[PDB]
Amino acid sequence: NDPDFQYLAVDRKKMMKEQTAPFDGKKNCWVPDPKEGFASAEIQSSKGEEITVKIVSDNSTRTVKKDDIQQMNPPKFEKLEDMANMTYLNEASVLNNLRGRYTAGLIYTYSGLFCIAVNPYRRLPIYTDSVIAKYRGKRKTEIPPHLFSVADNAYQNMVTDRENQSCLITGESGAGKTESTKKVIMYFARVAANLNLEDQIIEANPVLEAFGNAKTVRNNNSSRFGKFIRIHFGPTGKIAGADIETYLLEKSRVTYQQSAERNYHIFYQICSNAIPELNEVMLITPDSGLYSFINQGCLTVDNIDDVEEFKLCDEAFDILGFTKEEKTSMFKCTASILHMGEMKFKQRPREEQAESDGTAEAEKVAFLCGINAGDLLKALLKPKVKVGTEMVTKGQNLQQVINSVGALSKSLYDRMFNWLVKRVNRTLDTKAKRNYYIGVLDIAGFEIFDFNSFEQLCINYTNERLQQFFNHHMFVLEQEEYKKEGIQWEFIDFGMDLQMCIDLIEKPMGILSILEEECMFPKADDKSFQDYSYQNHIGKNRMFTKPGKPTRPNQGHAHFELHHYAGNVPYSIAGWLDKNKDPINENVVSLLAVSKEPLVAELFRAAFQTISAVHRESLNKLMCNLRRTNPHFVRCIIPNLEKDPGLVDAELVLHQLQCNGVLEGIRICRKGFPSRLIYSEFKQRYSILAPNAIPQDGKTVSEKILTGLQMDPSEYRLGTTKVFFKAGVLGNLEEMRDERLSKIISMFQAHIRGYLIRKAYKKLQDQRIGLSVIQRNIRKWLVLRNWQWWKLYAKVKP
Amino acid sequence: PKLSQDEIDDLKEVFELFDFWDGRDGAVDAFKIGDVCRCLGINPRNEDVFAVGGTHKMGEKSLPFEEFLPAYEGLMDCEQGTYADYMEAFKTFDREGQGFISGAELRHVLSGLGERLSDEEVDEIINLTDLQEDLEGNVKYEEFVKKVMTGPYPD
Amino acid sequence: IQEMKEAFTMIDQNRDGFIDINDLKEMFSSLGRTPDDKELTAMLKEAPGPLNFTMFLSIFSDKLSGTDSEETIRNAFGMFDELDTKKLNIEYIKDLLENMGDNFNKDEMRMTFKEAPVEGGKFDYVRFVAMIKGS
């Protein structure tokens, strides 16, 4: 209760100070608020599948359905820590306990396995060596909800148990997921030597943070790639150093900028007057609105001013280990792309074969690469093949090439990235000794939009796969707790339901395969593809549906809906067979292979396939890896869309918690026997429900209670140490307690009322004969004094 | 649920006596039909009595023995509490878990919960059982719960 | 049995060895203006005829038949006065008499408290039970 936990748990006072509510359990329940998502209520009269209802703070009489009506967790489970412990387990109930702890500064909670966290918008004491000193070694159930817990517990994992650990952290970068990441290592160190690595990597940030992070419609800055910062460990839990890896980064942002989205930040810092000394050498002008591979819509941004970094980056360079010599190749190389999209040509009139006009830029980039400006168009315009024996030049439709370049614009970058990594993978390759690690993957999570396409279907697929992974985890983690309790029958693996949706993507004649197919045939028509998938799916798969009812504002009508854990998503397969083609012109390779510059050499040094094709595998690479690492989780959440502390647009969290997996983990939880209890803390809490059948043990006292009570076997399952009940069970139990005490007290009160009176009774019987004697004679007297005769006697007494 | 002629005889004297306090006339105010039973031997509750005629205020409706006896039936059955029933409930406040509860907590239970008693009433019983609040203001809810149960005329 | 034969002679004026409707107002008026005929006659309506001594103390004895001692009565009060204060609060005893027991009627009341010791709101019963018992 010390001033440290000041921001961790609520002072035991407001537990004893809760008052207003009694939980008329029968009535007060959550309701679907269009303004607050789920507001508190109380009922009155139930007609049919309709209900007449009024609100709490308000008193609005709404008419709601018997379905939209959600159950409310009793006062008991409030501001509750691990939420898999609530009796009722739904959204509202979840939503709240989060808004509740939040509406009380609290920003960490355990949703089963998932650790939830909300951005405060106000840095707070929360992180300190003292606190770190406390958790240091303490198991989950010992101290409050806190990111530090996941860590040590991850630490404890890698060291004690042998193998590797992973801690999947996610949440729109409007949740500051990165800072939390900082912490994870700060702690992964301030406890790995107490028998910087932290800072070092924070500089490289603005490097990769001017690459893989761009302004995508919904975020001035979004990591468009997936990092897995592995932090290895030697024979004796020794930080060996720090290494990174770059998972599926979208190259696409290179050739196809949408209307509100342009490339990556770099060209925006390069074209910006950060350095007039280096502003020309690449052959480009200062304006950020005149570059075909950039002017599709956006330019500079608000709090971004896009300068300094281009200068600070310049520094992060020197800093590590690589002269300005290669550093230079960079600046320039980056330019090649710029002009590359700025190249022009033409074919013939009613014939198929291109020709130039932009040989200057062709000359530009070419030299900025050490290639004969005339070398390019030779292997580029009407290229050269390489069949079995003699290479035949392939006539060049504006098609194949126009894209072939969009391929070079990218293809280079990708490497020019994978390389850049390997480098920073070197700088810190300050190797000591390596045996294990505790990597920390972060990937852009699920995406449901106003208009969904190919790029979406993929991230999800990834995610769809990712979330599975978890299910399975929480499956086995459950499979032991049950058997560690003796109480154990079983239910099939959880991660199976997700297969249906997964195989409807990956597996052979499936959404992906098809597209992987039609990207070869030269008749690929958006509708042609649409056609095959249906004939291939719809009508006979329950994961592949058809664009239902327009749910929100004004949707962007599409061709189908995939049944994702998150929900059924609308995917507009329009222009897919057009974005996915990643062809290979086996010449440019060699051609770019050893031009004149070193890099240019090794990179290409070291077809006509597809992104998905790589995606598919690269993914495996990711998943497979994971399938061998005690998983951990962290789901940061952006309270609201206005960096305004306190505020909470539930809506914005329900969608988030819907895409976290949390809500599904719940659904997963719901099924079995969640709410477990120590017979110890079970009897004392629920002994009142059948006081007369308790001999007056513990695994017994409870044994009975449930029994005398009529507890339906379905409802629970006794372990050995503790007892498990069906979600919503305790709810009843509570309510029961609630009336019995209440009554039992009244009986006790009405047994006092007896006493008090059995007491006076006699005093009351004697008193009768008195009121009678008083009542009797005062009458007699009243008679004599009124008697005319008693007037004579009184009259004279001679 | 079938008073013996002894049992009935007893119901009379009481009823008889309780009607000499509202005014002989063979009528007992629906309000005392609770206090009457208490004298007979049953510790019914306010809900229990309100649901047999029982008026909330005195002098709202009077009862004849012929009308009364009926009601004395419904009350005989009303769930009467027990030592465990009680102890157990008084045990959910004994956080210390040693048979003690704040002197004021108690007062709270007895007149702040369920069918709130009356401060005078809480005093009367507290005074009638000499539940001497000890040292730091604490009482053994056990022995308080055994006295009230054994009535005001000890075994 | 004495205060009837001692004041016997004067129980009548002309002494016909008996009584006389005219010897009634004889020693009646002597003190204060007598009453109207029906009263003098009705006042005789009790003993259904020629009254004698034993038939006199059969009316004057008939009345005081069931009255308790000045201590009984006394005691009948204090069952209400517990702190042995020798006094009932005014409203408490009025309530006793008028709503409980064999209630007193508004008149019965009126007569009961016309001249009843009552200072500061405390009916002094030990004395009132003298105002009664010709104390």
Ligand SMILES: [Ca+2]
């Ligand atoms: Ca009456």
Ligand SMILES: [Mg+2]
């Ligand atoms: Mg005469």
